UniProtKB/TrEMBL annotation, chain B:
The lineage of its organism: Bacteria, Thermotogati, Thermotogota, Thermotogae, Thermotogales. InterPro entries: Glyco_hydro_beta-prop_sf, Mannoside_phosphorylase. Belongs to the glycosyl hydrolase 130 family. It comes from Thermotoga maritima (strain ATCC 43589 / DSM 3109 / JCM 10099 / NBRC 100826 / MSB8). It comes from the Bacteria. Keywords: Glycosyltransferase, Transferase. One of its GO terms (molecular function) is glycosyltransferase activity. This is Uncharacterized protein.
Amino acid sequence: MKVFTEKIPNIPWEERPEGYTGPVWRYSKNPIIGRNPVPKGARVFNSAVVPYNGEFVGVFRIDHKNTRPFLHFGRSKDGINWEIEPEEIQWVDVNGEPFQPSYAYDPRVVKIEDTYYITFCTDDHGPTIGVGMTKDFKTFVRLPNAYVPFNRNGVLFPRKINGKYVMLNRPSDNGHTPFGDIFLSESPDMIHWGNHRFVLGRSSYNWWENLKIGAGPYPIETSEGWLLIYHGVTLTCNGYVYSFGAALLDLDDPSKVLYRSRYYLLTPEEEYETVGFVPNVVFPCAALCDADTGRVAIYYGAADTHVALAFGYIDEIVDFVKRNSM
Amino acid sequence: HMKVFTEKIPNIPWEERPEGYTGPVWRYSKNPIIGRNPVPKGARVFNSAVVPYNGEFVGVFRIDHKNTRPFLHFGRSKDGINWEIEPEEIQWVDVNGEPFQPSYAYDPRVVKIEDTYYITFCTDDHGPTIGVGMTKDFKTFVRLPNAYVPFNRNGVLFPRKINGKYVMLNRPSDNGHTPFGDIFLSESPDMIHWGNHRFVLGRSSYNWWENLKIGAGPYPIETSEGWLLIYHGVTLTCNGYVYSFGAALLDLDDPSKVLYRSRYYLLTPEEEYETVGFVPNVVFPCAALCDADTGRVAIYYGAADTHVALAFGYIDEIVDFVKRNSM
């Protein structure tokens, strides 16, 4: 199988536990960061990480000590030990005027051609998908929001498809949405979005994802299709439980689902996932894949309190998705 | 004084105001004009997106069938009051001529832009959203891709491009009986891809009639005083919603800028055909005709989700009312 990502020789990595049978396993030293990450910060738990300049950089959601979310930039030599800026990213518009979001969270980072695009959730009389970019992680330029509210889990495909930018999104409500399907939209210019298509919806049969789902890491291009890692939610009598799984989408028409695992890849089990600000959440934010070895590192938010890592091999994950497909 | 940029409509449906009547808008004394069991398969007709066509009037009508499912039907009228409605729903094809039929469709609006009549409506795509269609002759109806992902309704286009862009009013919503709602606008170069969204108008805190949600009604009418937007406003009582309608004026060049907005509704449910029916206490404006020659306005509205009714007024008096009663 072929994977169309970067060579990442120094990807964060840990071998699977002896005799471990699952496609994806936790970093034994999780969580890697979480409470009181910076002087103004209460919890860090989203981490849109990419390789950059032989190292790693990320855009992090940090809830400050008023519980309001901000996006901070961070750097890491190894992807495990992070230096995060104490202050939030400052955004300007294409004209260079300040264009600062009221609040911002749920960051995703993906390189398309020569530019890193950053999506995030922000207010515009309700949650919607904000869109920004940077070529150097120094100057952050914010574009007009992609949608009117209410929308979240916006993430871009890592290249144009048929000459169009393609945005996964997740139509929502004003509150703690009790539903949600993944759609995609296309744009000629990163501003005007159209030709929307339903991609993937909540399952009736698989209880882990029968309440709502939403895209996580940007879709990874393989010869087997776009590998989409997505979270799925179920509602118990005591609240939501967020897990994550994966699907494979047709390369030419990503709204066509080829395979989708009936079982999650990961669900809350460890203390740092089952206890915290929002208990019982594993929320995948970014995935690195070393094209040379097939090694995959997934960054996920745990309990809305910590950043954690999980590892696997891309071909095993793809196999898991196909074999557990309905 | 004031200019209105619409067609001359000498035969507009019209009735003079009752003697000594003081309000800007009055109901047609012979309301409702159509409603219950309009066609063999039909239970109630109560949206009517009406435009002048060919010296007469045509419309796209929402008819709930006798399974209470909504469909859009084409209708014709010589005078705009007496309607002949097709017994079967409009059939839609895509730009390739392949069938592209909505699962269900309601809330139609019809607006001519240049040489083409655009029709927006509410349809399903895993939730309510704004569907978009077009016709040059009202014989062939071509449907474009929906303008938005769910959940959205009250989509209505501006009757011309503004700064080279098509502009769509819309109303971000819920999956259910939405307990909020602001009017936004979006722009498009091509009627397919939409961006540069902006909040236009939201629910009022002070005016209780519109404190729950609002939504665009008839397409915005271009006047020298701005875009006249007739919009519905909702309040929640302990026994349900009450829909009224009022009006705002939007800046001609940047319609997201509100110049004036009437604190009072133009119309609220008061008559039996408005306060009794499938959904009691609803007046829901769908279409406005304005005769550029005289300034006469005829507003088609749904009454209690049961009937089509008419209200009349003069555009200058309506505009005057909006300005005078602006917060």
